[PDB]
Every structure is written in C-alpha cells, then in structure tokens.
Amino acid sequence: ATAAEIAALPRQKVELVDPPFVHAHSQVAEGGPKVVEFTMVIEEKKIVIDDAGTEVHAMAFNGTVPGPLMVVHQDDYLELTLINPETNTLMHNINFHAATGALGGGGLTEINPGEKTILRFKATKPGVFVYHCAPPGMVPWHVVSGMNGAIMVLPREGLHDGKGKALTYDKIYYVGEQDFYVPRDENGKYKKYEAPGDAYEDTVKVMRTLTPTHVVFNGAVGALTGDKAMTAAVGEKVLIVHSQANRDTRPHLIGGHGDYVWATGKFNTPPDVDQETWFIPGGAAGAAFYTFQQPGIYAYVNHNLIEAFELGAAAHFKVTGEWNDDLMTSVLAPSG
Amino acid sequence: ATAAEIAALPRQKVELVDPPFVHAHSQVAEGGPKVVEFTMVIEEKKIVIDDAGTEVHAMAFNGTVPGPLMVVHQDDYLELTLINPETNTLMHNINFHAATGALGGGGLTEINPGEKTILRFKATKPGVFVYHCAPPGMVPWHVVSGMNGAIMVLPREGLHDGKGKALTYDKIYYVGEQDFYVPRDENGKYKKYEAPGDAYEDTVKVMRTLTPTHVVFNGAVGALTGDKAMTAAVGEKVLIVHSQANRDTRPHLIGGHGDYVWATGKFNTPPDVDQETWFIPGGAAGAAFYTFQQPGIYAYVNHNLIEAFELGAAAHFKVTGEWNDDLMTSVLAPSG
Amino acid sequence: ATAAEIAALPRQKVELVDPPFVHAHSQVAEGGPKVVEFTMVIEEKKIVIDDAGTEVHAMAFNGTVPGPLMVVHQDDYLELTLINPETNTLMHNINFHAATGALGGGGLTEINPGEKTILRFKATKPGVFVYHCAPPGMVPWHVVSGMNGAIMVLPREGLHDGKGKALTYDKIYYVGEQDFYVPRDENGKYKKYEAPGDAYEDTVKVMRTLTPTHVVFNGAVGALTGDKAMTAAVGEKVLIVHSQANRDTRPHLIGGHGDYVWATGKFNTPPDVDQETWFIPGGAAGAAFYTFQQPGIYAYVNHNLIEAFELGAAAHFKVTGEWNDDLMTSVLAPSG
C-alpha cells in the first residue's frame, strides 16, 4: 500500500486494560484494514514479587508486568505512541516480534527519559507474538526486569481449527510469565536497592547462572489466585494466551487440557490437539483453547513442578457448574 | 450415555507388569467400551540409584519408579483402586493428566497411610499421558521422589500415520525418565536419611537449583543397559513410550530414528516423521514408532549428552538379525 | 541396491567450505543417486572463544567448530574419509544422526591418532541432521569440545512447503551453536591448559552443573559479526540451518521471522510457518526459510536473551536494499 492509501484508512484508538484481562475486540474483523492506535507510558517502579516482600525494580510498559496485550487483525497497522517519562533513569525502546524491520522496531524507538516516539507497522502475520524492550548492550536486563508483553494478531476471519472449522472463544486471558533473578546476601535473603542501577552488577551475576529465583505469572507469586483467580463456567470456551520473552515454559491446566494449542503461537500453523502440557520457547507466545467440562478449582502452571510450586509459576481458575460423574467420579472416597 | 448404559458396561480387571514392560493388551479395541480396573499399592522405600550406593527415599506407585503403564482405549473408563499401606508415613494421591476434573483426580484421592480409594474416569482423549502424585503443598517433592508414571489411551481403531495408514507395533516399551535431587554434604558425598521427611529441607534446596544430581531411566543409572537392555530384531516394529513428569527431555535412539513420533503424545495430533531427536516437555509423555533395520547394540538416550553419559539417562537395545551393507558399510576399517 | 548396483553409481568428490558457508550443490538433484565423497581431517587445536582470551581445547572436524555442512540428496550415499593425524592425542570417530546402524557410524569409525577410515551410508531420510564424535566413555566431552556439525539431505525434488509448492533459496548459511564449559580458578578467572587431557577432570565438573560458561555460534563470541556477518538483500530467500548437538536452543531472527521452519529439521514433517522463535532440542538440527523484506542489520540469536547477550549466542545479518515504509515506519522519531 502507498502512503496515500494508508493515510486514508480509518483509525481507531484503543484503551488498554491490565493483564490478565484483554481490551475489548472483535474476533472476526469489523470492516477493512485499520490503523489501530495504542499509547503506553513506561514506568520504572519498585514492585513486590512475593509474600516475603521481595522487591524488584521493574521496567514496566503501561505500569504492569507483563505489559498489556494489544489486539489487532492481520493486515491492520499497529501504531504505538511510546512515552519514556523524565522521571525514569534509563533509555528504553520496543521490539515487536510481530513486526518486520529495524530489529522489530527497536532501532527506531530508542527514547531517553523525557522523550516519546510513534511507531507504525503492518501486522502481516496472524498469531500471538512477544514484544519487549531491547536497548543495545542491556537487552536481557530490561527483559528480565519485566519489560515485555505480547500482542495478538487475529486472522480477519477469526480463529479456526486445523480443518477450517471456526473456533470462537467466550473469554480470553493473557498470562505473561516472568523469570526474575534477584540477588541474595550472605544470609540467603533477597537484597533491596535504592535505584535500579545499583542492582545491575549483582543481578547480572544471578542471570549468568541461568537459574531464576522466581518464575511468576502477572508479576508476582500468587498474582492470579484468590480474588484475582481467573474464572470460567462449565461449557465456557476460554483462550489462554501465554508468553515468555526470555525463557522456556511448559503450560499445563491441572484438571483440564489444551483442546487446541497453537504451541508456536502462529495461527497459520495448525494447532496441536488434546494437549496435556504444551511448550513455548523463550522469546515466544503461545495460545491454548479449552472448553471447561468440570466445575471446581484448577491450577494453571508451568509444568516443571519446582518452577510452579517452589518458584511461583502457578495460577488458579475458579469454575462454576455441575459436576460430571460420567467424566470422573469417586467410586470409594478415601477410607480405611 | 445414560446412567444405565454406564452401569451396564463390562468391568475387566487387568494385572500390571513392571516397567519397561507393558501388560497384555490389544492395539485395536476388543468389544465396546469397558471399565478397566487396576489396583496399585504405594510403597515408600529406599532405593539405590547409582554405582556409589546413593540412596533415594522413593515414593513408588506399585513399588516401581516409574509407576507402571496402564493401557486402555478411547472412551473406556479407567477405574483405579489406590492403596496407601499403614506402614507408609505420608499422605498420597494420584493425578491423571488423561482425566478431566478435580485436578486430574488428585482432589478425590488423598489417602493417608491405612487408607484406600477408588477413582473412575472416562478416557476421552487418545494418547500417552503422565500420571503422578500431587499432595497440595508438596507436589514436586513427591514427583521427584519418583511418584509418577504414564498411561496410554489407544484409539479404538489402533494407531495410524498422518495419512490414515495403520501402524501396528510388534512390541512396546515404557521408558520413564526421572530427575533426582540428592543432597550432598560439604565434602560432596551424597547424604542418607532415616526417614523420607528428614530429607525434605535439604532436598528442596537442591530442587531449587533446577539442576538434578541424577537423570535416570527406570529408577537408576544403568537400569536399562547390559543384561537389562531392551531387545528387538531387524524388521520388528517397536513403540517406545517415554515420560518425564517434571522436566524436559529429548529422546534419541543412537543408530536409529523415530520413524513416526507423537512428540506431544496425543494421537489426534499427526506424528512427526524421520526424527533424529524428539522433544517431550516436563509434565508429558511422548511415543516413537521405529522399525529396526540393523542388528547390534543401540543406545537410547536423553540427547543432552551430559545428562545421558554423566547423569545417567542412557538405555540400550540389543538387536538381532542380518547386517545391511546397503544402509551402511565400512569401506575401509580403521587403519594406519 | 546390491553391492554391484552401488558400485555402478556415479561418484562425485565434494570440496568442503568453512561454516557458515556451504559447499556448492544443487537444490534439485542432478541426475540419479550417486556416491558423494567427502574427506575431513580431525584437528585438536586451541581456539579463543571470547575477548578475554578464554581458551578451549577444540576437537575440530576439518579444523572448525562446528564441522562443515555436508549436502547430499535423499537416497544418495555419503562416503566419508575421516582422518585422525598422528599429531593428535585422542581417539575419535563420527556418528551421523542421518545414518542407520552401528550407532550412526561411530562403531565402525573409531580411529587412533595416525589412522583413517572410510564409512559409507545411504541417506534414506530427508532433512538436516547433526553429526558428532562419540568415543565410548567420553562422549559428551568430545561433543562439547566442539566435535560436531551437521549435514543436509535434500529431497531429490528440492524443498517444498506444506502444500507441495517449491521453496527455492538464493542463499544458505549453517550456524552451529556450541555450549562450552570452561573451568575457572578460585578468583573467577578461566583456566588455561597445555593439553586436552589436562582439562578433562576440571571440565567434567563444570559440565555436570548443566550450566555453560559460553554459548556461541561458530566457536566464539561475536564470531558471526563484523567481518563474518552473514549477508543478504531485500527480496532474497535465505535458508538458515542451525544445529546444537548437546543442548536446546531457540533461534530467532531479530527484525524478521522464520517464514517456513522445519523445526524438527526433517523435510517430510511439514514446516511451521510465520515463526517468531523456533525450538531445536539438543541433539538435533533445524532449518528456517525467510525472504528478507527490509534492509539493515539483523541479529540472529538463541532467544534466551541471557544466553544471547551475556553468554555469546548472537550473530548478525547485514541486508542491502530499499526500506519499505508500508511494513514499518517511524511516524514520530524519538523526541522531547
């Protein structure tokens, strides 16, 4: 398309919402290609990632870890206004794995505190994709400080299974998984720092062990539990988008399955089916579609169980509805 | 199905056999859906896992690590009587990744020493699936103590390749891979404990490093080598089911291939073909089908070769038959 | 083929070139099956892997890490003359994951310094496959000392997408990824040695931590950058073959994608498409096909960003051509 044709396309400003929720959208595209506008302010902020009070100097797109999910359709243009407030101390940029050119956009979005930039790219490929900050020379440090999220580029005709049958979800959740590398003192207690820069050297030493101290969903151990647990109902169709910008993960819905899983996150690649545990490599997003069949509590985890239950990678689903004894039943309850 | 229809289904008790062998079964289903009954007694016992007398307080379904492979067909029901003898000291349960509801069955089978339970679930999805104990609050500890196994839910019409052609194996083996985390004292010697609970704190410390001290097949270094090597003959079709309940693995048959590999373990997902090394994420089982073409010794390993030859993840196959010079030949033997 | 039929086949002597380049070949087979001859001399030599002067005692096929890429077509025979100079100190052999029998050839090619051997095998399966040395009892040590490479067995009809449409590349590059485990002294300084065997004990201790000190392409940090950056032009189709003989990797072309990716490396397994980051398990090779659409510098990395930017797993592509503002444009450049 020419500059004139792009200038003529309708524009729609979208208000982002915080993970695990996703801003309102249509699965099947409304009309022809549009320039979808988003705005995100970067916030360097202290966040607590566990019940003990462990602190991390997060680098957060839109103030959250992960950054919010942006949703557009194939061949729409995503136009992002990215702002780096003067209150921040580091330069930041953004790299969309969904985009083509200039390192995903990082080469055109390096902004120092007090600057902003507007990047536009054509979403040519359908699927869920990671986005993350990547300043040359300090790439992993920003990413493992939480400066990453994902976007979803829906086919214009919505989702379909491998044989062309439509798959329409009732609800969608975005689970961003974060590996953190928090320095510890001689007592084995996590350290706290005044400014992000103070923690650099100590953090890089932990990073080099390739062993995170915490592996969490939505920025903290237990973030998606209790009143923040995800919800569904028997018969409800749920799409769970999951991303990990730096390290591998293996999602598993305890008590359920991934009925259709685009493990690579790309919609033109037919989904695997009937999955117990799927795999998303570091640097990618994946998506699983499931129709709940049993009520009760479910745990959604990274199935390296040490990472799930010792390091923090566990979320819960609260599901309403009638129990199905055909599917499962306790013939003899625990007894002598 | 109605309530009467379920109650009318035939019940059949099956005798289990220890891994890597598999109990008697038919690839194509015999008769209509059935309630297949299995019974497993849980044994907490000390086992030696290496050539240095290193001990692990194993938590073993049916007394073996891994627990035995249970085989049923799609839409059969699996009805398991699980027994936890009064001589054990810990509460246990079972979670079938093949099952739907109550955390895979874990929520309905929590049995203390001196108790038993019977769980029934409908095997609605075909494939090989992991099963493992998962007591709330102590999930990875039980799993990495060897309390895991797998089941196979065969399609009622048996296995097929991506084009619908039948794949009938002559024999099947179940290789359960286990990551162990054995504590060491300041001198580097593995520690021994009187009771399982005594090792809990020390073991979790090792678990959190995400670095196993041992990675083994059938519960010990060398368990499937030498006189315990698996066997085959040139021309024989072999299915190798592999599971890892907590950590990733990458099986490889040294000297052969995976002709058809259901890497995700689900039969409704077309198998990959001509595989050199396949990948099974922690929390899943996979299956590989291979027709042997050359006699001799083969090594079957986790292809992170440090895990295989330093940590213990290596098995052998002894194959009989005639050598095929067309496939391979020494044109010039090692010489000056 | 009978011995006579094979003897009547034409022979072609190939000249190998150093990675990341690939020797001359035709994508579509020229004529019928042939016996393709290759010769490689094993070189035990010191290589410097980082800018701190860190040394590794490399065990290099053809004098390079990785060893060179060998290209043949399905059902051709690969006849390798392997030489172990008397100037070397250890016994070596070769195992082709592409071959069938004798542990992939290792059982028929064990050569001490001063010996040579000639192995012939039929390339029955199409795809890219790892090859590596594997001396019984010292397997991982030789592999992580750089003694590994890959071969590509092209379909006789060249490459095709999932629907059978031809995929023809303009350029091809071979990236061999290597995990190194270099011993450190009590001051954190990397140790140096005057003989390969002198480093065995120390290296094994590091290998057992499953934590490499370096993860690099083509044997060294920054190897494939600057004077060795790979090149292309907008509109050019490029195949990137990637191998890792011992440990998992997750390739990603920063600023681009894997339009078609044979993640398992096997051409009869349909390729995934529109990939952001693909996954290659330790012990395998994979291949990605991409058509460049934007000029500029691209970074090709293992997307665990710590491995890429702290440990050494990053390469560059320098692409010429016109910028495409439809695909991406800076609406507002970084500004106050």
Ligand SMILES: O=N[O-]
């Ligand atoms: O099914 N989760 O251990």
Ligand SMILES: O=N[O-]
């Ligand atoms: O070729 N197996 O190390």
Ligand SMILES: O=N[O-]
């Ligand atoms: O987009 N790769 O950092």
Ligand SMILES: [Cu+2]
């Ligand atoms: Cu940043």
Ligand SMILES: [Cu+2]
């Ligand atoms: Cu990236």
Ligand SMILES: [Cu+2]
């Ligand atoms: Cu248990």
Ligand SMILES: [Cu+2]
């Ligand atoms: Cu599980």
Ligand SMILES: [Cu+2]
């Ligand atoms: Cu060697």
Ligand SMILES: [Cu+2]
């Ligand atoms: Cu190998």
